[PDB]
């Protein structure tokens, strides 16, 4: 209930494009994009556990297998369609996990500024500690103070250049998240908790589009590495954007998706 929205295509089509959002955000991030795709594609947006309109129980572990089941249940209603699964950042981690472990086969995969998790154990632990600390800060200091600090992360420096409306929308989307739920999201499916999917990338056989922002060096290096390992992948670097490409250059982002979707119609 409430955790996913289906937007009927303006035309008959067997194509369904499924959007997963990032941490501290929800499906509203795709708001201005939906109409660009419904022209030719059915669109689904899904709020992940703890985010936006999600109503996952606080008393269940929101690990990847839980999220996979969640997605299985939605996608089962469209299993006979050609499903393109799109994930941005946190949602891309879910989309990679799902491409590898999901129970409904997807047709195509799209990854924006994401990673298959952390390879080496000590780095996984480093990240767990940080996300665990962050979760504690959320449970205790609340959403506003967290977002204030989150806004200042180097990862998001390129956003400081966005039009004030856009920065407002992003800030509002973050502030509306429940801090206790954000904490649980971090503890249960933060990157530090995610299995290292690097050695399973070769299992992903579907056409895959990988997007990274040129200013976002870390995720560019990750995107290139992922592309090498996913056998039918295209990696596109988006000029003059950081991590959240779909917000910083929405049109180019849209053009890249539509063109990929165009190419893979077969």
Residue numbers in the entry: 1 to 266
Sentences from the paper on this structure:
Menaquinone, vitamin K2, is a lipid soluble quinone used by bacteria for electron transport. We turn our attention now to MenH, the enzyme which catalyzes the third step in this pathway, a 2,5-elimination of pyruvate from 2-succinyl-5-enolpyruvyl-6-hydroxy-3-cyclohexadiene-1-carboxylate (SEPHCHC) to produce 2-succinyl-6-hydroxy-2,4-cyclohexadiene-1-carboxylate (SHCHC). Rigorous biochemical analysis then proved that MenH is actually responsible for the elimination of the pyruvate side chain (E.C. 4.2.99.20) and that previous studies had been compromised by the inherent reactivity of SEPHCHC, which slowly decomposes to SHCHC and pyruvate. The high-resolution crystal structure of SaMenH, an α/β hydrolase, has been determined and detailed comparisons carried out with proteins of related fold.
The enzyme crystallizes in the monoclinic space group C2 with one molecule in the asymmetric unit and diffraction data to better than 2 Å were measured in-house. At the end of the refinement there was continuous electron density for the entire polypeptide chain, residues 1-266, missing only the Gly-His residues that remain at the N-terminus following proteolytic cleavage of the histidine tag. Approximately 65% of the SaMenH residues are in well-defined elements of secondary structure. These comprise 7 β-strands and 11 α-helices arranged in the α/β hydrolase fold, a central β-sheet with a marked twist, sandwiched between α-helices. Helices α1 and α11 lie in the concave face of the β-sheet and α4 to α8 form an insertion in the canonical α/β hydrolase fold to create a domain that caps the active site. However, in SaMenH the core β-sheet consists of only seven strands due to the absence of the N-terminal strand observed in other family members. SaMenH behaves as a monomer in solution, as indicated by size-exclusion chromatography (data not shown). The residues that form the SaMenH catalytic triad, Ser89, Asp216 and His243 are positioned on one side of a water-filled tunnel formed between the cap and core domains. In SaMenH the main chain amides of Met90 and Phe23 are well placed to form the oxyanion hole; indeed a well-ordered water molecule is observed within hydrogen bonding distance of both nitrogen atoms in addition to the side chain of Ser89. The active site has a pronounced hydrophobic patch created by Trp150, Phe156, Leu153, Leu155 and Phe219, and in addition Phe23 and Leu186 (not shown) help form the base of the site. There are six basic residues in the active site (Arg93, Arg127, Arg134, Arg174, Lys218 and the catalytic His243) and a single acidic residue, Asp131.
